[PDB]
Design a protein around this nucleic acid. Structure first.
Ligand SMILES: [Mg+2]
Ligand SMILES: [Mg+2]
Ligand SMILES: [Mg+2]
Ligand SMILES: [Mg+2]
Ligand SMILES: [Mg+2]
Ligand SMILES: [Mg+2]
Ligand SMILES: [Mg+2]
Ligand SMILES: [Mg+2]
Ligand SMILES: [Mg+2]
Ligand SMILES: [Mg+2]
Ligand SMILES: [Mg+2]
Ligand SMILES: [Mg+2]
Ligand SMILES: [Mg+2]
Ligand SMILES: [Mg+2]
Ligand SMILES: [Mg+2]
Ligand SMILES: [Mg+2]
Ligand SMILES: [Mg+2]
Ligand SMILES: [Mg+2]
Ligand SMILES: [Mg+2]
Ligand SMILES: [Mg+2]
Ligand SMILES: [Mg+2]
Ligand SMILES: [Mg+2]
Ligand SMILES: [Mg+2]
Ligand SMILES: [Mg+2]
Ligand SMILES: [Mg+2]
Ligand SMILES: [Mg+2]
Ligand SMILES: [Mg+2]
Lengths: 181, 258, 181, 44
RNA sequence: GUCGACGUACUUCAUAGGAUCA
RNA sequence: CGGUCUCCAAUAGCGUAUAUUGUUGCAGUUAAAAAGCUCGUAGUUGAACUUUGGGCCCGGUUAACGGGGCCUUUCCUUCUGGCUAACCUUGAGCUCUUGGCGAACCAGGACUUUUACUUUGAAAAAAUUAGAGUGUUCAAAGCAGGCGUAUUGCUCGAAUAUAUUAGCAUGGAAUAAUAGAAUAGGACGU
RNA sequence: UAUCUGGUUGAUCCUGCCAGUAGUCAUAUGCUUGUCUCAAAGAUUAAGCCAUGCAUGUCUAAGUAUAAGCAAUUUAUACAGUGAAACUGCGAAUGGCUCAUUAAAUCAGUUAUCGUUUAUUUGAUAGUUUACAUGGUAUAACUGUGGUAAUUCUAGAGCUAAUACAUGCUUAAAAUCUCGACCCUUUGGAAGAGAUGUAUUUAUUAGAUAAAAAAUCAAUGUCUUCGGACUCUUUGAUGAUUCAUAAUAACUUUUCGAAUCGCAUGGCCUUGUGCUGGCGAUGGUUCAUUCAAAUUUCUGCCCUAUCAACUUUCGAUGGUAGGAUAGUGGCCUACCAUGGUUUCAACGGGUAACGGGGAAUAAGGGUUCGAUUCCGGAGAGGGAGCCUGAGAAACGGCUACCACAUCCAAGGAAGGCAGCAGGCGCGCAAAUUACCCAAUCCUAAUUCAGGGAGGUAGUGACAAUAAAUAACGAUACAG
């Protein structure tokens, strides 16, 4: 038979889901960023936990260790590239200082809201899922799309979208035809 | 099993072939030939996954049946012929010649050579013995039996073989200071110079090799292949000249060139 | 029916082993070929690989070698006189390796008479004179020569090669076997 | 596993035979229903 | 046979103490 | 009598039932568990001691730290072979050169207490695990790909680590065993 | 357990206690089930039973076509294109499936074959034995005559081929060794007749050496300056061999050493269908190599001591010789000894025991799971035994027995889904009796044919990724 294809879980249930403070924190996060469910928050928390555990394990290694140098430099480069970590904080200690909000801000939903293309996080989500947002020349319909620093300046309305210079949607030309008739 | 096997699973194939794990369920089993199964590169992998001339096995067969491929100066038509180390592959239509030499990573490289360098190869003398009628002969690492050898040729020496006649033109003794190429183990693909051969009776002899950067490593004698005197190899060497570079140095160079 | 497996035997500790697998062809055996003196009967046996084994079911002549004189002649086999493994092979006249047999002495007598010009043209006399120094032989061999039957020992395996070759006993070996007889 | 109950012992009689032989060799050192048993006891 | 012993599985009884107040 | 409602949890997922010993490191007076007592085989365990210290040289890291050499009563022995340093000397200008002597080093044969322990190197298939690179539209993944382009084309990868015990090679010589000269049947020899 | 909730009284605090609240994974089950990527399909310890269909065939210029086959034709009066059937060769021993047995057995790492077989590939390798080319010691397909209810049943008669079967020649010189007519008695010589490659069997010999010099006995060879003199004198590998190799004497129901095929028509001439000659295919001995096989050294397995002695009559431990095997070996036989294992746990028993790579959990030590994508082992309903072949103790090969079970005219004949689909095992339930060789690779005489191997799609939310079910305003009503 053919060789297996790998798969993995991108989220995990927290140790105590029922903590009242935790429930309030999830409520605030979902409301601020317009997240659909607690699964997305768990996903970002799982990613952050993985990153911080890797950073801690590297820190346990003695300085100048080739493994520490190579892996820590790669990790810091990735975090700086995605935008979570600022340029001036290029150390493993500041990697442990990251928070879920830093990742959530980089989502294409929040970026579309912030850049002024949308009036709310929910309006940004609707614009994304309806194929109105293009990062460069590529239409992206995934709200969880993580925007890189270089990609940040190229978010715009898609060429095919009615807002981006294409013809009006079905409703607009429908109403125009009915008015004309 | 009740007899020899005829199939080879992709996951069971040699790693250095670099085959996709999802492309299919089977991999080309090298037919019997000069080189061992795990030390060989079947022509299908070379023509398809390395040169990219053929897009599928059928196109490889179409190429071979046109008799466009020569291995060591002789035309081969078998898709899974086990081409191996130091084998000269000639494509006259493309006017191209290749020598199968490991790169530092341990994988057969696409190394192009000149026509003059494609006229000969090198062979490690695996055995020296008298045949029938008292005619001495040498058996090399690719299974070539060459009769009437120079008496000075002994085991572990390297003989330069002319492909047109299959006769020994020159030979190199195994001694300290000789340039060697590692053909097995985790040091596969490295080039260095012998420093000392540690001899153990009834066991495996070990050789200490010093590379150009002064690093030293120990390897079993079976994996060593003499290729010339220091700085003067008898064959053109691949890019990097068999020097291992740490991951950090590779990163630095890659960023520099990019 | 016959098998050469070691599994069916008890372990060195005395444990009774269980059956690991069914009997295999590559560990087979075949019925013994009790070769006997008589008109030649030999039949081939097809063995592992393409190789062939010849079964001497009967044979009445053999190539026996006189080692001291460095010769060998084809002679008739009179009969088995002594066998070290078992006596029933002696009783039944079964030819097997190491069996002590009696062979017709005529060809050896003829050769010795021709070679040395002795008993047990100018060129012939010259050659006899040259070889005169070696004429003397052991007394025990010459007594047998007078008898007409020489003691010999079979060095071939008749049930494998199909041959009943051997050599005439001499010296200490002859003395030992005469004592045993 | 050697002498475990089989679904259809009759269909593999030969197999059973081997087991018996094995037992006779293995346990040679020693040899050298509820209702039925209770019924025998009460009858006695 | 509402039989004895054992093995196994369960049920149950033993929780309030110090300080203030009325 | 007639007559033909609100909130909470998860969310394309949610519910129900069954199931799910102490080496590090347990306890033994009074609430589990010290055998009535002694002897004793296997097993486990078992006092101390034998080269310590001192004087110099060399080259490394960041005045400390580690690594090598000598000397100090301390060098394995022997034979053979290969090369040959230095040392004596002639001659020509510290360098060549004549002729002796040939240490060190290397190769081999004899000669040889045995292990435990630990360091280093090979070996321990691929897949899997960790992990580097890569905008599969994101991701799970995959080992892809990337850059120019009127024309013919160029080019980076497919890294790296882990893997117990046993076997092999190697540096240590602390700790714990093992053998030796006592009727000398001992060591050495030009 | 932690956190949180509640109860412990006439009430409120502070302790303590009690009850409920944690977890993924596994099994079974219920309700719901829109989109994209992706992926799996065991289980009554029942390795229990199977209707039906398929799953292994294969031809190039290069083995054999007067098919009374097709189409082309005078490129072909031996054939010549294509080609059913059949002979010949190869494959069918790979792949796919299941985990029954198996507790130093398998398996993991590590060794050995100086202990053996090896189709095939790759490299070498054969002047030594009517030929302008031998037979039926011969048949298939086919023609024709038939039996049977029935099967991949086949009987008689007539034909005819080969890379089938069986035979059998052709090719240089030299050297050496034997047997020696004859001349001659020498220090003797010698016409001639034979023998020699390989393979098998046996016996014998060589396969040297830590380094230097002499005297004679016997045989006896080159030489000069007739006196004595006589040099460079041949030997590979291993840690190690009776090794590689060579030599002598024979032996063999005894082998091999091309009676084969395709394409092309070059060079010499004394002009003959004379001599010579190219590129390939297929066979063939031996050696080496490759794919493998067999055996093998060391260490490592869960519960059990209320299993303490076991093995040895019928091989258990070892020796000698033989037999057998491809080969070592008590593997077996004959004769011998009395040995071998064990409290450092033998032997016996249990295993819902195939082993490993791996999976889960855990802070670390540990504990558990592993039929299940790769590797290795074993099996094809249960025992047993074999033909063929390089390779099988084969089962989509054969024979018997045990249990089941199909057809039958009752005389006989045919069986093995733990292969892909699909059924039964209950009266209660779960993927399609689907398409294809396009990719991966495998088989063949072979680019072309075949491949339920494999891929493609279909089908219960297996396990996983992403993610719609509305967004922006105005008006209205109410606290
Ligand atoms: Mg559109
Ligand atoms: Mg060896
Ligand atoms: Mg004691
Ligand atoms: Mg002590
Ligand atoms: Mg180890
Ligand atoms: Mg339902
Ligand atoms: Mg809906
Ligand atoms: Mg759509
Ligand atoms: Mg025709
Ligand atoms: Mg056939
Ligand atoms: Mg058992
Ligand atoms: Mg073992
Ligand atoms: Mg073949
Ligand atoms: Mg060949
Ligand atoms: Mg006939
Ligand atoms: Mg024997
Ligand atoms: Mg016996
Ligand atoms: Mg298990
Ligand atoms: Mg089982
Ligand atoms: Mg398993
Ligand atoms: Mg089988
Ligand atoms: Mg069945
Ligand atoms: Mg069978
Ligand atoms: Mg079947
Ligand atoms: Mg099968
Ligand atoms: Mg099925
Ligand atoms: Mg052919």
């Amino acid at each position: 038979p053919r060789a297996p294809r790998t798969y993995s879980k991108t989220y995990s249930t927290p140790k105590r889901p029922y903590e009242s403070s935790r429930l309030d924190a999830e409520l605030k996060l979902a409301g601020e960023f317009g997240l659909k469910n607690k699964k997305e928050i768990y996903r970002i928390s799982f990613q952050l936990s993985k990153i911080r555990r890797a950073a801690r394990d590297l820190l346990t290694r003695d300085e100048k260790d080739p493994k520490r140098l190579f892996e820590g430099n790669a990790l810091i480069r990735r975090l700086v590239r995605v935008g979570v970590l600022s340029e001036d904080k290029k150390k493993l200690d500041y990697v442990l200082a990251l928070k879920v909000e830093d990742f959530l801000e980089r989502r294409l939903q929040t970026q579309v809201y912030k850049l002024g293309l949308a009036k709310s996080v929910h309006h940004a989500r609707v614009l994304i899922t309806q194929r109105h947002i293009a990062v460069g020349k590529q239409i992206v319909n995934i709200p969880s799309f993580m925007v890189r620093l270089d990609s940040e300046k190229h978010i715009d309305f898609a060429p095919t979208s009615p807002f981006g210079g294409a013809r009006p949607g079905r409703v607009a030309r429908r109403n125009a035809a009915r008015k004309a008739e | 099993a009740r007899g020899p096997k005829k199939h080879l699973k992709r996951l069971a194939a040699p790693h250095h072939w670099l085959l996709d794990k999802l492309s299919g369920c089977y991999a080309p089993r090298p037919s019997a030939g000069p080189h061992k199964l795990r030390e060989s590169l079947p022509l299908i992998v070379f023509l398809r996954n390395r040169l990219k001339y053929a897009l599928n096995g059928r196109e490889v067969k179409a190429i071979l049946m046109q008799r466009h491929v020569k291995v060591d100066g002789k035309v081969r038509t078998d898709t899974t012929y086990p081409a191996g180390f130091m084998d000269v592959i000639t494509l006259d239509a493309t006017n191209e010649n290749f020598r199968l030499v490991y790169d530092v990573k341990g994988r057969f490289a696409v190394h192009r050579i000149t026509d003059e360098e494609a006229s000969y190869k090198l062979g490690k003398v695996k055995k020296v013995q008298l045949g029938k009628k008292g005619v001495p002969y040498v058996v090399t690492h690719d299974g070539r039996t060459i009769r009437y050898p120079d008496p000075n040729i002994k085991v572990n020496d390297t003989v330069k073989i002319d492909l047109a006649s299959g006769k020994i033109t020159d030979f190199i003794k195994f001694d300290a200071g000789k340039l060697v190429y590692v053909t097995g183990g985790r040091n596969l693909g490295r080039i260095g110079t012998i420093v000392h051969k540690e001899r153990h009776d009834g066991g495996f002899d070990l050789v200490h090799i010093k590379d150009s950067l002064d690093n030293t490593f120990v390897t079993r004698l079976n994996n060593v292949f003499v290729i010339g005197e220091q700085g003067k190899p008898y064959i053109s060497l691949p890019k990097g000249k068999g020097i291992k570079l740490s991951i950090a140095e590779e990163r630095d160079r890659r960023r520099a060139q990019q | 029916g016959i098998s050469r497996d070691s599994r069916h035997k008890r372990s060195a500790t005395g444990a009774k082993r269980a059956q690991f697998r069914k009997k295999r062809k590559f560990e087979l055996g075949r019925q013994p070929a009790n070769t006997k003196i008589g008109a030649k009967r030999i039949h081939s046996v097809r063995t592992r690989g393409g190789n062939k084994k010849y079964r001497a079911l009967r044979i009445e002549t053999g190539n026996f070698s006189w080692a001291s004189e460095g010769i060998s002649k084809k002679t008739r086999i009179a009969g088995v006189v002594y066998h070290p493994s078992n006596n029933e092979l002696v009783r039944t006249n079964t030819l097997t390796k190491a069996a002590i047999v009696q062979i017709d002495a005529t060809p050896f007598r003829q050769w010795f008479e021709a070679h040395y010009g002795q008993t047990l043209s100018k060129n012939a006399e010259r050659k006899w004179a040259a070889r005169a120094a070696s004429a003397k032989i052991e007394s025990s061999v010459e007594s047998q020569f007078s008898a007409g039957r020489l003691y010999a020992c079979i060095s071939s395996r008749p049930g494998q090669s199909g041959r009943c070759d051997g050599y005439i006993l001499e010296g200490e070996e002859l003395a030992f076997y005469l004592r045993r007889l | 596993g050697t002498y475990r109950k089989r679904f259809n012992e009759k269909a593999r009689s030969g197999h059973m035979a081997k087991l018996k032989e094995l037992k006779r060799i293995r346990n040679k050192q020693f040899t050298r229903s509820k209702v039925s048993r209770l019924k025998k006891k009460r009858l006695d």
